[PDB]
Amino acid sequence: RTVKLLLLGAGESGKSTIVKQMKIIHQDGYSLEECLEFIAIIYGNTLQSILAIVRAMTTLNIQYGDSARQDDARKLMHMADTIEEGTMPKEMSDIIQRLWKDSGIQACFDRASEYQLNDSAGYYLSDLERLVTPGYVPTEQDVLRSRVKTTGIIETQFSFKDLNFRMFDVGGQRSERKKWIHCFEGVTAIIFCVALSDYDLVLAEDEEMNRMHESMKLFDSICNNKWFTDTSIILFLNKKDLFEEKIKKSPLTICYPEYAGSNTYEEAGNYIKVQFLELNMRRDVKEIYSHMTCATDTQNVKFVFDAVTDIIIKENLK
Amino acid sequence: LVDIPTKMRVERWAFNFSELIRDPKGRQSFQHFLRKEFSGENLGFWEACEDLKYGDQSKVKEKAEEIYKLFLAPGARRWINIDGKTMDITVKGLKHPHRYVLDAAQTHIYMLMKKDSYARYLKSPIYKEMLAKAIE
Ligand SMILES: Nc1nc2c(ncn2[C@@H]2O[C@H](COP(=O)(O)OP(=O)(O)O)[C@@H](O)[C@H]2O)c(=O)[nH]1
Ligand code: ALF
Numbered sequence: 167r168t169v170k171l172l173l174l175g176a177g178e179s180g181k182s183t184i185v186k187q188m189k190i191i192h193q194d195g196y197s198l199e200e201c202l203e204f205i206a207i208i209y210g211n212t213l214q215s216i217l218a219i220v221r222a223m224t225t226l227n228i229q230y231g232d233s234a235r236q237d238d239a240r241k242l243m244h245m246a247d248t249i250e251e252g253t254m255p256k257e258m259s260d261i262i263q264r265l266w267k268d269s270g271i272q273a274c275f276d277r278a279s280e281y282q283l284n285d286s287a288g289y290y291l292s293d294l295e296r297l298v299t300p301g302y303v304p305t306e307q308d309v310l311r312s313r314v315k316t317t318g319i320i321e322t323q324f325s326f327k328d329l330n331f332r333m334f335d336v337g338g339q340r341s342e343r344k345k346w347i348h349c350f351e352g353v354t355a356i357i358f359c360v361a362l363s364d365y366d367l368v369l370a371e372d373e374e375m376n377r378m379h380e381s382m383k384l385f386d387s388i389c390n391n392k393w394f395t396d397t398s399i400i401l402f403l404n405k406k407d408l409f410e411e412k413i414k415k416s417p418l419t420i421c422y423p424e425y426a427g428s429n430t431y432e433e434a435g436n437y438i439k440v441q442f443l444e445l446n447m448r449r450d451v452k453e454i455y456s457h458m459t460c461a462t463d464t465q466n467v468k469f470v471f472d473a474v475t476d477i478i479i480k481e482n483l484k
Numbered sequence: 485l486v487d488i489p490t491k492m493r494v495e496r497w498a499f500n501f502s503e504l505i506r507d508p509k510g511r512q513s514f515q516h517f518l519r520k521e522f523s524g525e526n527l528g529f530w531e532a533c534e535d536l537k538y539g540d541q542s543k544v545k546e547k548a549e550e551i552y553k554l555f556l557a558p559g560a561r562r563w564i565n566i567d568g569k570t571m572d573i574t575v576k577g578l579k580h581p582h583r584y585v586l587d588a589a590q591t592h593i594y595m596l597m598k599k600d601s602y603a604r605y606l607k608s609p610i611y612k613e614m615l616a617k618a619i620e
């Protein structure tokens with residue numbers, strides 16, 4: 167039997183990353199040639215990540231640990247406009263590695279919530295040397311961590327537990343959502359992604375809007391839609407790993423002023439969980455399941471998707 | 485007359501994204517691809533940009549004005565996916581419309597296609613066949 171699955175969620179919530187894990191778990195993963203096609207995407211994120219941090223230094227008026235680094239910054243900005251997109255020359259990675267070790271750069275990096283920085287900034291930057299080592303070949307995690315804004319609607323198909331999954335991945339930015347209506351017919355189940363770590367961030371579309379509030383408005387509109395009352399709705403509270411770390415330094419009261427619980431993964435995590443589940447108008451008849459997930463973690467995803475698959479399988483024989 | 489690309493030509497559309505988009509048949513074949521992934525508004529915006537910079541400079545204020553209405557405006561019919569930074573810079577220059585006003589917006593949508601859409605194109609059947617129907 168066939169099953170139409172929908173991956174919905176705001177921009178940068180983890181959707182495509184899930185797709186990547188489905189490929190790794192139910193599609194024989196990547197080949198060497200494919201793995202290598204990500205090197206440029208990785209060098210691209212890396213650069214864009216260090217560039218944003220650098221620019222934030224002046225925007226947030228933070229000063230370098232060592233004044234010398236100022237030139238390195240200027241020369242990086244230049245090489246950014248002259249080299250070939252998606253490459254990383256020795257003289258460039260040398261400049262990036264020196265900025266990274268700067269105490270002021272780190273201070274700005276720690277304030278990533280104050281501007282727009284890729285989730286994987288610290289992942290790549292921390293290990294740039296490994297990435298530019300001759301003979302470098304991306305690791306699964308390196309691929310999983312790669313960032314590419316997706317536009318449109320893309321289908322990927324795989325079989326599992328004797329079910330033919332037709333999984334549809336969409337774009338999350340506001341302009342892409344008007345295209346979702348084209349897939350609402352015959353939806354067997356919707357996996358809705360929510361970035362747990364978005365509570366102190368603002369949208370790329372509107373830096374005045376909090377990312378989680380945006381996410382809450384979106385989910386509210388989706389779970390309450392005539393086209394899904396007979397569709398399985400699973401909530402993926404994603405980026406647990408990033409969330410359990412910033413919740414130790416950044417108070418959830420930034421998103422919810424009324425929150426009085428402790429700022430710890432467990433309590434704040436459940437508070438966010440509740441605010442989303444309580445958006446359902448008919449939870450009376452239709453229940454919404456939810457898992458704390460880390461889309462970049464294959465084991466967690468393989469586990470959670472197995473559970474999602476059971477839900478589907480069970481809601482079907484009724 | 486019809487335009488039937490040769491083996492080489494079709495083959496070099498996979499050398500780099502610009503090669504595929506600088507070719508009329510490339511774009512045309514690329515459009516059939518985006519239409520399937522519901523992201524054809526990006527290639528339309530790109531062209532529109534070209535037609536503004538390299539078109540009759542007599543009606544720039546006219547074109548940009550309607551480009552904003554078709555691709556940039558909130559809820560616009562061919563609404564494109566650009567960030568807020570890139571969107572403000574643009575709405576700013578549209579107060580004094582000129583040829584290279586959509587630069588920022590265009591460079592953005594260019595890379596959007598290049599990193600996401602393009603990649604999947606060279607893998608699609610719509611390309612394998614284009615290549616199979618290659619001359620000599
Ligand atoms: N550490 C970490 N990164 C994640 C998780 N999920 C997505 N990411 C990263 O966040 C960025 C955005 O994810 P992506 O799949 O493109 O999101 P979507 O397509 O907007 O839903 C990518 O660089 C991913 O590697 C996560 O659970 N943990
Ligand atoms: F929602 Al996205 F890339 F931002 F898939």
Ligand SMILES: [Mg+2]
Nearest residue numbers: 181182315316
């Ligand atoms: Mg995506």
